[PDB]
Amino acid sequence: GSEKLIEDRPYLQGMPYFDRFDYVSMMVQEHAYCLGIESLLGTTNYSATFTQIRTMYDELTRILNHLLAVACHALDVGSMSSVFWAFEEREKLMEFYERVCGARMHAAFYRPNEVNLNAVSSFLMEDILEFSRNFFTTLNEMHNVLTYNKIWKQRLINIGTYSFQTCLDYGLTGVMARSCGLKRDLRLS
Amino acid sequence: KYNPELYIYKTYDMAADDPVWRQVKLDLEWTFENIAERRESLGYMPTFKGDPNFWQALDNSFSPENIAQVQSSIGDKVTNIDTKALALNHQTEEYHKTSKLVYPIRTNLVVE
Amino acid sequence: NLNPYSYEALKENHWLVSDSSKKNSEWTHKSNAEQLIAKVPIIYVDSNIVRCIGGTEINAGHPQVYIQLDTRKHGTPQTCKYCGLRYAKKMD
Amino acid sequence: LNKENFNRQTTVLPHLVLSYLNKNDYNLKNTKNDYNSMEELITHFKYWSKGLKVESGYTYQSVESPKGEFGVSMLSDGSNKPYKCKVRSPALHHLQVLPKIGKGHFLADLVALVGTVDIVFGEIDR
Amino acid sequence: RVDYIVTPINAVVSWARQGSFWPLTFGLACCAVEMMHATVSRYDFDRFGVIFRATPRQADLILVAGTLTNKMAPGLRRLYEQTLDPKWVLSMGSCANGGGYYHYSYSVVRGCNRIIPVDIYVPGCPPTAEALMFGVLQLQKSLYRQINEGEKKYNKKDLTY
Amino acid sequence: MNHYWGSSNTIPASSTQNNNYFSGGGNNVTIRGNEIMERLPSQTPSQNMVQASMKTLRFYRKFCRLIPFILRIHNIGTKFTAQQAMINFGNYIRERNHYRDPGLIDHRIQLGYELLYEAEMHFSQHTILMQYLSPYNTPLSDRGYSYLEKVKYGNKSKFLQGFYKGNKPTEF
Amino acid sequence: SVYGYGISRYNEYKRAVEDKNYGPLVATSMNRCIHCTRCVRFATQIAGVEDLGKTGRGKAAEIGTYVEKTFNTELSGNVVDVCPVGALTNAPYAFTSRPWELKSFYTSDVFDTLGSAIQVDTRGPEIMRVLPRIHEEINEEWIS
Amino acid sequence: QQRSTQLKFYDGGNRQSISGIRATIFGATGFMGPYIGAALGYIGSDVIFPHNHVYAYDDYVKELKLCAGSGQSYIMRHFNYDDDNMYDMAIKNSNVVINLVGSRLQNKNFQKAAYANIHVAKKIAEACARNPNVRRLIHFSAAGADTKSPSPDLHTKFHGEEAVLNAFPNATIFRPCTVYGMQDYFIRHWIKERDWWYHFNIVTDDCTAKRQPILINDVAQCVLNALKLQESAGQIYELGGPHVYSRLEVFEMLANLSGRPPKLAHIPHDIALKITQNFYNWEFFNMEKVIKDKLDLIVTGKHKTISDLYVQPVSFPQGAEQFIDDVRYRGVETHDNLEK
Amino acid sequence: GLWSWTINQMLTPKFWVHLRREGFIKTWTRGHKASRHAHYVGGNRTDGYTKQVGEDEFGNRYYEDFDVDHKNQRRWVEFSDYFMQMWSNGDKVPVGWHGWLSHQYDDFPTRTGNSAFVKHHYLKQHTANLSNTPLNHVPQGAPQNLNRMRFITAQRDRSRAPWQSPKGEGVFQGKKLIVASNSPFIDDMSIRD
Amino acid sequence: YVGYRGRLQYIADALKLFIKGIVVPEGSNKFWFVAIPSAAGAICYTFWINSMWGPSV
Amino acid sequence: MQNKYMQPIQLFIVFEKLNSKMWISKKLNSNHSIALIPSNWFYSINLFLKRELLFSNITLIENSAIDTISYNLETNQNDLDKTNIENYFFKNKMLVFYNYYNYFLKSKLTLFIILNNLNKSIDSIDRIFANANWLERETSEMYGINYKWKIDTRKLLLDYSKIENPMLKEFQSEGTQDAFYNIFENQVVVLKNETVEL
Amino acid sequence: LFRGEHALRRYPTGEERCIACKLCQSACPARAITIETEPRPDGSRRTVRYDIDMTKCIYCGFCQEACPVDAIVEGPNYEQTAYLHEDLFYDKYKLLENGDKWEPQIARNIEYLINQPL
Ligand SMILES: NC(=O)C1=CN([C@@H]2O[C@H](COP(=O)(O)OP(=O)(O)OC[C@H]3O[C@@H](n4cnc5c(N)ncnc54)[C@H](OP(=O)(O)O)[C@@H]3O)[C@@H](O)[C@H]2O)C=CC1
Numbered sequence A: 001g002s003e004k005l006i007e008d009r010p011y012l013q014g015m016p017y018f019d020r021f022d023y024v025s026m027m028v029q030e031h032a033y034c035l036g037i038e039s040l041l042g043t044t045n046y047s048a049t050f051t052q053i054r055t056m057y058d059e060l061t062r063i064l065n066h067l068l069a070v071a072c073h074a075l076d077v078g079s080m081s082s083v084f085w086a087f088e089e090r091e092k093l094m095e096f097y098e099r100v101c102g103a104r105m106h107a108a109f110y111r112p113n114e115v116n117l118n119a120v121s122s123f124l125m126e127d128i129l130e131f132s133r134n135f136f137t138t139l140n141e142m143h144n145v146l147t148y149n150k151i152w153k154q155r156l157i158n159i160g161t162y163s164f165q166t167c168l169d170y171g172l173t174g175v176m177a178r179s180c181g182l183k184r185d186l187r188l189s
Numbered sequence B: 001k002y003n004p005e006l007y008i009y010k011t012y013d014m015a016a017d018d019p020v021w022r023q024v025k026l027d028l029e030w031t032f033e034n035i036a037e038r039r040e041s042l043g044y045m046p047t048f049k050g051d052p053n054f055w056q057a058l059d060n061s062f063s064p065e066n067i068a069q070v071q072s073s074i075g076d077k078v079t080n081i082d083t084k085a086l087a088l089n090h091q092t093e094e095y096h097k098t099s100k101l102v103y104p105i106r107t108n109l110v111v112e
Numbered sequence C: 001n002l003n004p005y006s007y008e009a010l011k012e013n014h015w016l017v018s019d020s021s022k023k024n025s026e027w028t029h030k031s032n033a034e035q036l037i038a039k040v041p042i043i044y045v046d047s048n049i050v051r052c053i054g055g056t057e058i059n060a061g062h063p064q065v066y067i068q069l070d071t072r073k074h075g076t077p078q079t080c081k082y083c084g085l086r087y088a089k090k091m092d
Numbered sequence D: 001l002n003k004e005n006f007n008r009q010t011t012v013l014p015h016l017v018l019s020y021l022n023k024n025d026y027n028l029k030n031t032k033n034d035y036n037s038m039e040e041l042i043t044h045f046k047y048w049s050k051g052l053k054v055e056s057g058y059t060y061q062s063v064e065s066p067k068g069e070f071g072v073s074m075l076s077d078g079s080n081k082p083y084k085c086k087v088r089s090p091a092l093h094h095l096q097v098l099p100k101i102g103k104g105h106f107l108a109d110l111v112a113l114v115g116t117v118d119i120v121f122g123e124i125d126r
Numbered sequence E: 001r002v003d004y005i006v007t008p009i010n011a012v013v014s015w016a017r018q019g020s021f022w023p024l025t026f027g028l029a030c031c032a033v034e035m036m037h038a039t040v041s042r043y044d045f046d047r048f049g050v051i052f053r054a055t056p057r058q059a060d061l062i063l064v065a066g067t068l069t070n071k072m073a074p075g076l077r078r079l080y081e082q083t084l085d086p087k088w089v090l091s092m093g094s095c096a097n098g099g100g101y102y103h104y105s106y107s108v109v110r111g112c113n114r115i116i117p118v119d120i121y122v123p124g125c126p127p128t129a130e131a132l133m134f135g136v137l138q139l140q141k142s143l144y145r146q147i148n149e150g151e152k153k154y155n156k157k158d159l160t161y
Numbered sequence F: 001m002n003h004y005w006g007s008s009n010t011i012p013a014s015s016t017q018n019n020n021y022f023s024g025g026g027n028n029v030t031i032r033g034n035e036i037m038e039r040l041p042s043q044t045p046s047q048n049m050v051q052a053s054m055k056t057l058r059f060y061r062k063f064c065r066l067i068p069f070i071l072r073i074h075n076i077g078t079k080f081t082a083q084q085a086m087i088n089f090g091n092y093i094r095e096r097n098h099y100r101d102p103g104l105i106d107h108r109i110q111l112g113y114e115l116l117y118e119a120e121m122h123f124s125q126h127t128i129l130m131q132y133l134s135p136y137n138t139p140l141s142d143r144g145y146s147y148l149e150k151v152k153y154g155n156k157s158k159f160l161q162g163f164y165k166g167n168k169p170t171e172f
Numbered sequence G: 001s002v003y004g005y006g007i008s009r010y011n012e013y014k015r016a017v018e019d020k021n022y023g024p025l026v027a028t029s030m031n032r033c034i035h036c037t038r039c040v041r042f043a044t045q046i047a048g049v050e051d052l053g054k055t056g057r058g059k060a061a062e063i064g065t066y067v068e069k070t071f072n073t074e075l076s077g078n079v080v081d082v083c084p085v086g087a088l089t090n091a092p093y094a095f096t097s098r099p100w101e102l103k104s105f106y107t108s109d110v111f112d113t114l115g116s117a118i119q120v121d122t123r124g125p126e127i128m129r130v131l132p133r134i135h136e137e138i139n140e141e142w143i144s
Numbered sequence H: 001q002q003r004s005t006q007l008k009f010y011d012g013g014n015r016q017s018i019s020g021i022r023a024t025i026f027g028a029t030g031f032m033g034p035y036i037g038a039a040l041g042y043i044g045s046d047v048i049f050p051h052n053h054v055y056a057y058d059d060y061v062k063e064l065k066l067c068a069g070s071g072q073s074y075i076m077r078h079f080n081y082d083d084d085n086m087y088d089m090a091i092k093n094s095n096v097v098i099n100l101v102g103s104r105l106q107n108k109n110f111q112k113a114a115y116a117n118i119h120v121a122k123k124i125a126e127a128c129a130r131n132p133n134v135r136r137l138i139h140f141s142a143a144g145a146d147t148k149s150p151s152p153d154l155h156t157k158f159h160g161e162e163a164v165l166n167a168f169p170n171a172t173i174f175r176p177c178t179v180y181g182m183q184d185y186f187i188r189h190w191i192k193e194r195d196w197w198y199h200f201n202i203v204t205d206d207c208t209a210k211r212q213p214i215l216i217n218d219v220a221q222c223v224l225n226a227l228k229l230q231e232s233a234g235q236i237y238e239l240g241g242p243h244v245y246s247r248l249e250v251f252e253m254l255a256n257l258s259g260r261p262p263k264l265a266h267i268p269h270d271i272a273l274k275i276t277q278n279f280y281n282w283e284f285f286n287m288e289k290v291i292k293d294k295l296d297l298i299v300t301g302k303h304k305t306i307s308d309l310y311v312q313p314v315s316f317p318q319g320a321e322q323f324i325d326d327v328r329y330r331g332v333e334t335h336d337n338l339e340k
Numbered sequence I: 001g002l003w004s005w006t007i008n009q010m011l012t013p014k015f016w017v018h019l020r021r022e023g024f025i026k027t028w029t030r031g032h033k034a035s036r037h038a039h040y041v042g043g044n045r046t047d048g049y050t051k052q053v054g055e056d057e058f059g060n061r062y063y064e065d066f067d068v069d070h071k072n073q074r075r076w077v078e079f080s081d082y083f084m085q086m087w088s089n090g091d092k093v094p095v096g097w098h099g100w101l102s103h104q105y106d107d108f109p110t111r112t113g114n115s116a117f118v119k120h121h122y123l124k125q126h127t128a129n130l131s132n133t134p135l136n137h138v139p140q141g142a143p144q145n146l147n148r149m150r151f152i153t154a155q156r157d158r159s160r161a162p163w164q165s166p167k168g169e170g171v172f173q174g175k176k177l178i179v180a181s182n183s184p185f186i187d188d189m190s191i192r193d
Numbered sequence J: 001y002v003g004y005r006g007r008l009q010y011i012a013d014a015l016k017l018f019i020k021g022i023v024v025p026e027g028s029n030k031f032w033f034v035a036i037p038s039a040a041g042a043i044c045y046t047f048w049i050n051s052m053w054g055p056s057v
Numbered sequence K: 001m002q003n004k005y006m007q008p009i010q011l012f013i014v015f016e017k018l019n020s021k022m023w024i025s026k027k028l029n030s031n032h033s034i035a036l037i038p039s040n041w042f043y044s045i046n047l048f049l050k051r052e053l054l055f056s057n058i059t060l061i062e063n064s065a066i067d068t069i070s071y072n073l074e075t076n077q078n079d080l081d082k083t084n085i086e087n088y089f090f091k092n093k094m095l096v097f098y099n100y101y102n103y104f105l106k107s108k109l110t111l112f113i114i115l116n117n118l119n120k121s122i123d124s125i126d127r128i129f130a131n132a133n134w135l136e137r138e139t140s141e142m143y144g145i146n147y148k149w150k151i152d153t154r155k156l157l158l159d160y161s162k163i164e165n166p167m168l169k170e171f172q173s174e175g176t177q178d179a180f181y182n183i184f185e186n187q188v189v190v191l192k193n194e195t196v197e198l
Numbered sequence L: 001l002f003r004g005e006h007a008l009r010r011y012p013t014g015e016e017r018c019i020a021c022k023l024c025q026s027a028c029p030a031r032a033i034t035i036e037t038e039p040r041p042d043g044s045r046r047t048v049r050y051d052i053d054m055t056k057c058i059y060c061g062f063c064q065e066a067c068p069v070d071a072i073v074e075g076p077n078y079e080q081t082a083y084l085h086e087d088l089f090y091d092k093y094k095l096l097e098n099g100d101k102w103e104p105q106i107a108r109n110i111e112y113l114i115n116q117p118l
């Protein structure tokens, strides 16, 4: 009942409810809530836009979600170590994120039009660069076992083949729309 | 649509499979090396050092005798309650106490 | 010493029954903070107006509050509206 | 190269853009606080007790989350609480199409498709 | 004259039961996401021997992690009954503890203790992986100790009568 | 038809024969169907209260036809007999006899059919499904009954009986 | 929050004036007293008692009585309802709660023969306080 | 009198409501204890249970903790059972004191049977007279409690009932006759013996003993009604079924409800008693069980009845049918029955 | 529980130095104290034993070595209580050492002189988890709470304080039982000149 | 943590597997449900017979 | 709003019988337009959108109902205009908003249907748009909007054996029914909800 | 910034930092903080009861963020596993003791956090 739960509380009182909605991606939902609040307020978070922290947090959340999805898909297919690798990467990402809010998976740092400018360290950026190098290495290691494995290919080749009209009928979006050949993405619109 | 650009997984390195990704990796390595060299140039690093006097009951605007009496009333002997220093730091706006990390950062072994 | 609920006591402690032993508050408020703050002495201040924040810096304690040390009666101390500290006039 | 500068220490300056472009707001934020400004104290009280008032109206804002377009449609009747708040989670759409995609597949293929549908049960349940 | 061997036997049984406290592979929400992160290489629950078992008939530790609703309470009770004895229960997360943010929701069980008996609870929402590990360690210590809690009284010959 | 109530959604009597070597047939009116109910189309719009009443009677008959299987499968036959459960359901339906909106009646009928199918699919717990089938004003036949109120409040009016009990906790 | 500037810019020490003592009905906080003359006007025109006036000048004008006394005029509950700031408050209700935690229901009194309409604010099983209701046919907007 | 039994309660509440009843329950780790705890807390009552059952990880203690809602139930651990101070602390602020502590069927030693029953009843009742806050005191005794009974458990129950009546003048002595339920020890005993043998059920006599089984829910309702009745203070109540049945009749009823053919292999009572006395006793094998099967347990009518509490118990056949659905013999059934 | 320090670990100058310094008991006990890795016994570098960075009030000894192969495994602490392999728990750490060991702040607790944390009068010693133990925190209105009756009476008296009726024998002025009021306030108008 | 450096995890696992109780569901034939494990175990230990550890060994 | 935007007047041109009322605001994006439509020509509008060039490349983005029964402008009451969605909602009892995205025109359209009948019955677009099945099921389960001639009327998110519409202005936060564990039944039972209040 | 165990902070003299502003109760998103306040015997604005239901407390730290006198804090204590759901319902005295145990590290964290904008 998150709908009525938010509807019966003030605007800030329902803030963490968005994190519980998308458990894997708690930053994208918070950013969406902040943008919607700003649109209702008719303004924009100047400090958040100028600091690029919103973009960095969205990219980190997207990376974490992709790692978690890869781990779950590998576990379901039968790969038991990619889950551990993606979980280590997600642990590093959550450690980086918690330096801004103090929580591993429910940060709720993004406010409607205010930004906690004090919680900004350059050491965080340096560690983010180091984590980016480590994540590149981890992605290479993961692709070394899932991209070319014949078992994985035969377990995914031509599986669930959808199309443009099929996606349009049910409104499939995101990675599904991208795989269906649809070039629709709110980021680049 | 009439001239697609296709990214094809061909090498064992997904980063090598994309020229932009290899450039990003090289840029990250160069930036890390430059930051490391810039830090190594100084050889010492400032760091935030808390002080027990920061958790003092009264601010600098208070009188010197009153500050010492307040510090003694709470049974405080760890924070600096010197009257001379309190008078000398009257209405001060220093940043904070800071420590200096001295390179190289190595484990202090007890070997004999 | 004076019996509680007296007219003089009500006039003194702003129409409240002050607790000397402070155990009544330590039970009612579940904390001996009343007696702990009462252990503090009375401070004499030269200025007729003081700025109290309960600490050493802005946001390091309570919000700054201006207390008037110069009243109708000389030597009447005032406890902080933000902290437990009390300040009084230097001389009168 | 300086000797006592964070720029000398770290090349990244997270406050440089905001300080250069919005110096007035940057100084106002770095200088005044609720413990020092009575207006800021009133702002802290209102934000923590009743919250900032929102003009009446219905809007729909979507953000490109990793699972797709996650949208929030908020209609506020002018009060501190929105009159209605609907959430369009792409996970719900992915769940609505799995049977259309699951037809003809074996059990292992069904498990693989459930994994590849990118559906988070919390997003669908709301 | 049966408690002499039983006491060493009780100690060995307690050590064995603590060494194979297998958590149930049953997770629901962000608390369960944190618990899964506690199964990662960085957080080696295998060091304490916690290996997730899918079947309640073969499980000993019920890691109730998530929010309980009106559409899941009977299933939770059925799983708790179907859990092989002896069994321990640990409710991780505020939702599993007392509903948490949804403590006033019409579609919330309003507490997992009102549905199934719970042995241990974790406070965080979500609790850290370290918090879950500490809770598991405390539960293991309690289970090892609870086997011989000195319920029986010692006779004049220092023998539990 | 391609529906949960369709004639072809019947479990074959034999592994190779529908009903017998001479004729076919199966039981789906009083028992569950062969496959799950993929879709539950909304009831056709009835513009007449006569049609609404006919639909309500059909729903009541359908519910009655499955009361035996519902009681047997849930092991809740001790609480009340099949006729007793039918009488209780009839009383419950009579409680809502005041309705006069065809659309509301159709929506209620659809919801009731969905709930019955959920019960037919055993997706709901028996202890919760007993709420609709429980006796209106009589003790459950699966447990003993105490006439303490009937004896103590013997011939006592409803107002007096309510006054003697107390509407809220007596301690707070 | 509505008609204000948004930020403060007067970075100086604030003036301070000690509060007064007027009994257990009027809670005095002269520091927040904006010298709005609301108390003086209400006492002179509504209650009819003459004990409130403006003493001093400049930035140190005293919003209170000249001598130390209590304000007992059977309308002390209107003094708190008349102060636009936290200068005058209900001492029995002081620090009781905030408006965010009070549930108000409109009813009529029985303590006075007029039965003036009032609003009783309560929090849970405990009744918090009562305030006057605008009833020109019974008692305008003042109560005993 | 000097101790007022008045305990006004609002029973119209729920699990999370407030009824005004504070209770201390001793010896609730059995089958009836959890039922009584659930019955009292169902109207929103405060329950405190002192317990020291070995192997505390057993579901009994955790389930007893679930008898009342969170913040309404307390489980005192490692009660000494011989400490008057501990007993006084247990019911320090409790208006109800319910003692169901009694010798288990597996318990066989005459000393322990006498010790547990007699001493516990005496100490609990004496403590009940020292705390004036107690409004009601209840002792769960056996229906077949008699002084001359060959069953040492029955003799100790009669002696403990006498001691409890002596120490506390306004006590309530319950005498249930073979209460039937889910975790009971008669239907469960028969099912367990039949399943372990898979051929027949062992009997040691002619099964001519008369019994009047009652439902556990019926017993709980009767206990609630008695707690709601002032005249029940200092009264002995008997709880038997609506109709009397022999042991053979009970076996036949169980077979008819379950459909399993009732086959009973008879054995010599003397040799059976000698073997069950000359060895260690368990829940499924007890000389006390043999003696009780060789004993008559009926509602003697020497005191008040469940009818005095005005509760009409349901049929034991109906209860058994409700309780043993899944143990039915798999006979030839219609095709519709295959889809269960 | 045997062979806390293996031969390979014992075949290093660090092992000999530590054994000669701290003794055989301390050398063996460290392996049973805070066993993290057989190659990490007393540190990763084999040239010597890592120095004791500090000592906790509960007897725990906190050390740090940068030679560990894992970045998150820099600082370690050895507890005094090692009854079993899983006897100690993560709740035995002091409040001062908690920030240092968790990398919350590089500042570490100091026994005397300059201290990384303040030392106020109201400081209380940190204790382990009191859950499932007799020292568990007791709410005011819990059933096992020995004084929950007083708390319940106080809570009820907030808005539902009962009337103190007479209890026992007393004078009766007609049908009105004669009893004096117990109001703490004193009516001065009735007794004044 | 199973003993010294977790050297006895297998023994603890076997002991715990012994410790946990097993209940046969009422909906299945207890005879077959029990005979299947016993038959599997008897067949399991027989693998040691058809094994050679050396020449004619 | 520096992109090319135009009102989809082709809808009213094809309809030729409905007075078109369109609204565009800067609170939403530059490609979002909201129009009120009569429920009578609702299936017809849906079909025309679903099978028309320059509009067939559309997908239903979201669908949500608004209980316009108690939605009242809290502040700035005098600021209401004569062409305001707030005034329109205050006029009606419920407002069903369906938001679709047209990739061919790359725009966002929001059809708002005003419901005033007590039955809250409207036609179902499930037979037109595939995603509308689960969406309309959830909408009916939460707000009671009766989708006539719908593909499936089965429950979506509501608890089993529970007949209520929690997403309604009348329903309190706590509800009315709470489930506990009945030891007398050895299973989960449901009773009245006695909730703790702040 | 780790939002650990909820605790009640105090001034260095030991006096209660809570000024009974009800900001924490109005800021608890789930209303997990309950306050019952009356004038103190000395006249201070302090609560007679301050309760935090950890069963309904998200440990979000919003009360600390909106704390007016830095009273409610989130100490680093994370090993707060409770064997009793009733024991999990912390109260005023329990919070005061928890703050007393971990005040030093909390003080260092507060000083460092204040120094961030300072
Ligand atoms: N079952 C029946 O049909 C009938 C039962 N009764 C009596 O009803 C009573 C209540 O029944 P029920 O709930 O099933 O209880 P049980 O008979 O099954 O168990 C005995 C209870 O008392 C405790 N207990 C046993 N021995 C001792 C002892 N020496 N000292 C202290 N405590 C002890 C047990 O705890 P622990 O786990 O620690 O052993 C348990 O709580 C019993 O005493 C029984 O004799 C009477 C007539 C018929």
Ligand code: SF4
Pocket: A020, E029, E030, E031, E032, E066, E067, E092, E093, E094, E095, E096, E099, E100, E101, E124, E125, E126, E127, L058
């Ligand atoms: S307690 Fe918190 S983290 Fe856990 S499931 Fe609930 S909202 Fe999510």
Ligand code: SF4
Pocket: G032, G033, G034, G035, G036, G037, G038, G039, G040, G063, G064, G082, G083, G084, G085, G087, G088
């Ligand atoms: S009513 Fe208040 S603000 Fe106005 S003059 Fe009086 S004290 Fe000052």
Ligand code: SF4
Pocket: G032, G085, G086, G087
């Ligand atoms: S609440 Fe109002 S009167 Fe009180 S200090 Fe704040 S602004 Fe002034």
Ligand code: SF4
Pocket: L017, L018, L019, L020, L021, L022, L023, L024, L025, L066, L067, L068, L069, L070, L071, L072
């Ligand atoms: S914000 Fe701080 S001072 Fe104000 S009521 Fe809450 S805890 Fe007390």
Ligand code: SF4
Pocket: L006, L027, L028, L029, L030, L031, L032, L033, L052, L056, L057, L058, L059, L060, L061, L062, L063, L064
């Ligand atoms: S930490 Fe968050 S949820 Fe917990 S009491 Fe504070 S504001 Fe409420």
Ligand SMILES: [Zn+2]
Pocket: C052, C053, C054, C055, C062, C080, C081, C082, C083, C084, C085
């Ligand atoms: Zn102060």
